[PDB]
Structure 1
C-alpha cells in the first residue's frame, strides 16, 4: 500500500482528496490529508466576513464531515518543511513519509519588501485573518465617537485595485450604513480608499466592466487612487507617492490586496519557483519529481496562446485537484496518466451584496443577474465537495 500525502486542504487539496476517495477502493493506498485547521474555508467568500456582511461560519466547513475516515486519515498540523531527498514532510508536531506528494499549501501575501506593510497591514486569506480585520474595523469605529477629531479611525485603505480589492471595498461600502448607525458615526466622514500602483483599475480586465465597477463603487463613496504606489505602512496609515512627492494618508486600517505568491515553504524546500509557484509539467508534477504533484496557487501554468501565466484562481485549483486525483489513481494502478488542460469559464466579481460584474457563457453580465449568477457558481463548488447536504446547510 503506497502512501499519498496531501498538504493543505484548500480548493486543490480537498478536491484531490475527495477525488482519490471516489476513484480508489479500500486498501489501495494510504491517504493522509494535512491541514493546519480542522476546517476548510471558502476562500473566494472571505471578503464578506472581513467586511462583516456575512458570518464567517458561512464560509467554512468541517473537513471530517466531507471525507471518509476509513479512506482518508486527516492530520491537523502545520507543515514546516519538505525534504525531497528523504521524501519526508516535517510538521510542527511530527513527521510524515510519502510515496506520492500533493502540495496545495496555497498562497501567502507578497508585499514586495514595502516597509511596514507585512507588519502593519492586514490580509484577507483565512477565517482567522478576516475575523481580525472585521473586529479591528469595528474597534476603530467604536473609538471615534469619544474622539470625533480622529477621522483616521473612519479611514480604510485598501492597497491594490485587483479582483480581491474591488470585491472587498464593495462589501465595505454596503456595510457602512449599519456600521455608522451602530457607533453614532457621521457616514460622510467615512473614507474607503482603493490605492493602486498600476495605471488602471482592475488592470487586464475589459474596460467596459471596469468603468461600470468604478462608477458603482464611486457612487457608493469609494475613492480610487490610481498610478499611486504605497511607499510605506504604519499603524497610523500609509505614505503614498503623488506627482513625485510623498503624501501621507492617516488611516487606522490598511488592508493589502496588492499581490500574492506561492507559499514560501515550497521555495524554501528547494523547488525551483517563479513568485513561489512551480512551473509544473503537463501532468501537474514538479519537474524532476515523478511522484510530487502541485495544485492550486502553488502551481504555475503558462497559456501557450499568449505566453502569459494563468492567475492563481480557485477555478483552476479545482481543475488541478480533479486531474491529480485521476492521475494518481492511474499511477497506483500502473496505468498511463492524462495531461492537464485548463478550461477557463467565466468569473463574476461582486460589487457589494446586490451588484456584480463579469463574463458568463461569453456574455457580459450586470447587476442582479450577475449577482445571482455568482451565487449559483459558488453553490456549484459546495455541491461538488459536500453534495446537496452542504448546499442546503449554506
Structure 2
C-alpha cells in the first residue's frame, strides 16, 4: 500500500485525515497523522480560555477519539524538517517515509523583527499559550492589592487590531468585572489597550461594522490607539510611536496579535514562499511537486477577480482538507484530480460572550443574532469532525 503522511492535526490536517478515512478502503493505503500533541484544539475559540471566559478543555479534543486506528496511524511527535529529495520527514524522536505528503503545520507569529516581541510578549496560538496568558494575567492582578501604586499590573496591551485582537479584547472586557472582584481591584484602574499601526481598527473591513465594534468595545472600557505602531517590546511594557515621537506604555501583560505567517519549517525545507506560505497550484500541490500537498495557513491562494490573496482562515482550511482528501483518493486509484475552488461564505467576529459582527452572504449582522450565528457555525465544525456526540459533549 502507498503511504500518506499528514503533518499537523489542525483544521486542514484533521479534515484531510477524516476525509481519507471515509473515502478510502481498509487496506488501500497507509495513512500516518503526525501531531505535536495527542489532542486537536479548536483554534477559533482560543481567545476565550486566554481571557479565562471559557475553560480550555472545551477548546480541544483527543485525536484518538476522532479517528480509526485501523485506517489511520497517529504519531505524537514534533516535525523538525522535510527532505523533498529523499522524501523523508525528520522528527525529534524519529523518522518517516512518504509517497504522499500533506502539510498542515499551521501558522507562526509574525513579529516583523520587532525587538523583544518574541521574548517579552504572548501569543494566542495554542492550548499551552492560552493557559499561560490566562494565568499570567491573574497573577498580575493578584500582585496589585499588595502594591497599589503598580497600575501596570492592571494594564493589558494587545498589539494589532485585527480579528484576533478584537475578539480577544472583547473576551477580556467581559472578564474584568469577575476578575476585579476576585482580587479586590478597582475596575476603573484597569486598562485594556488595543494598539493598531493601521489608520483604522480592523483595516480593510466594512466601516459600519468597525464603527459598531469600537462603540461596543469602548463601552466596556477598551482603549484604541490607531495609527500607532509598536516600535519595540520590553519587560516593563511596549514602546509606541505617537506623533513622530516615541512613547512608553508600562504594562505587565503584552499580547501580540499583530500577524501570522506560515510555519518556518516549510520555508526552511527549501520551498519558495511568500510570508512563509506556499502559493499552491489549482490542485493545492506545492509547485514542482506532484506528491506534496499544502493545506490551511501554510497554503496561499490568490483571488482571480482581485490580485489580493485569501486570508488564512479556518473556513478555507477546512475546504482545503476536503479537496485534498478527495484528490488523494483519486490519485491513488489512478483517477483524475478536481481543481480547488474556495467558497467564502463570509465571516462573523465575536465581541464578548453576547455580541458579534459579520458580513454573511453580503448581509450585515449584529448583536445577539450575530452571536448565535457564530456559535452555530462553530458547532457545525464540531459536527463535521466528531458527529452529534462531540456537539453534545461540549
TM-score tier, shorter chain, comes to over 0.9
Taking the aligned partners of 2:384 and 2:235, their CA distance within structure 1 comes to: 42
Taking the aligned partners of 1:119 and 1:91, their CA distance within structure 2 comes to: 26
Tell me the residue number matched to 1:128.
Answer: 128
Report how far residue 359 of structure 1 moved. 1.5
Report how far residue 38 of structure 1 moved. 0.2
For each residue in 1:170-209, what CA deviation from the matched residue of structure 2 results, as whole angstroms up to 9, or x when unmatched?
A: 0000000000000000000000000011111000110000
Taking the aligned partners of 2:13 and 2:225, their CA distance within structure 1 comes to: 37
| Segment of structure 1 superposing worse, 206-215 or 359-368 | 359-368
For each residue in 1:225-244, what CA deviation from the matched residue of structure 2 results, as whole angstroms up to 9, or x when unmatched?
A: 00000011011100000001
Taking the aligned partners of 2:347 and 2:393, their CA distance within structure 1 comes to: 24
For each residue in 1:57-103, what CA deviation from the matched residue of structure 2 results, as whole angstroms up to 9, or x when unmatched?
A: 00000000000000000000000000000000000000000000000
For normalisation by structure 2, the TM-score amounts to 1.00
Deviating 4+ runs (over 2 angstroms): none
Tell me the residue number matched to 1:38.
Answer: 38
SS at structure 1 position matched to 2:26: coil
Taking the aligned partners of 1:391 and 1:291, their CA distance within structure 2 comes to: 35
Taking the aligned partners of 1:113 and 1:360, their CA distance within structure 2 comes to: 36
Taking the aligned partners of 1:389 and 1:91, their CA distance within structure 2 comes to: 33
Taking the aligned partners of 1:289 and 1:100, their CA distance within structure 2 comes to: 10
For normalisation by structure 1, the TM-score amounts to 1.00
Tell me the residue number matched to 1:366.
Answer: 366
Report how far residue 361 of structure 1 moved. 3.2
Taking the aligned partners of 1:48 and 1:297, their CA distance within structure 2 comes to: 21
| Segment of structure 1 superposing worse, 6-15 or 361-370 | 361-370
The unaligned stretches of length 5 or more in structure 2 are: none
SS at structure 1 position matched to 2:265: helix
Task: Give the total of aligned pairs.
Answer: 394
Taking the aligned partners of 1:290 and 1:217, their CA distance within structure 2 comes to: 48
Report how far residue 263 of structure 1 moved. 0.1
SS at structure 1 position matched to 2:66: coil
Report how far residue 348 of structure 1 moved. 0.6
Taking the aligned partners of 2:179 and 2:353, their CA distance within structure 1 comes to: 15
For each residue in 1:2-23, what CA deviation from the matched residue of structure 2 results, as whole angstroms up to 9, or x when unmatched?
A: 0000000000000000000000
Taking the aligned partners of 2:227 and 2:258, their CA distance within structure 1 comes to: 13
SS at structure 1 position matched to 2:102: strand
| Segment of structure 1 superposing worse, 37-46 or 359-368 | 359-368
Report how far residue 346 of structure 1 moved. 1.9
Taking the aligned partners of 1:352 and 1:386, their CA distance within structure 2 comes to: 26
Tell me the residue number matched to 2:70.
Answer: 70
For each residue in 1:330-364, what CA deviation from the matched residue of structure 2 results, as whole angstroms up to 9, or x when unmatched?
A: 00000000000000012110000010000123311
Report how far residue 146 of structure 1 moved. 0.2
TM-align CA RMSD = 0.4
SS at structure 2 position matched to 1:343: coil
Taking the aligned partners of 1:102 and 1:74, their CA distance within structure 2 comes to: 14
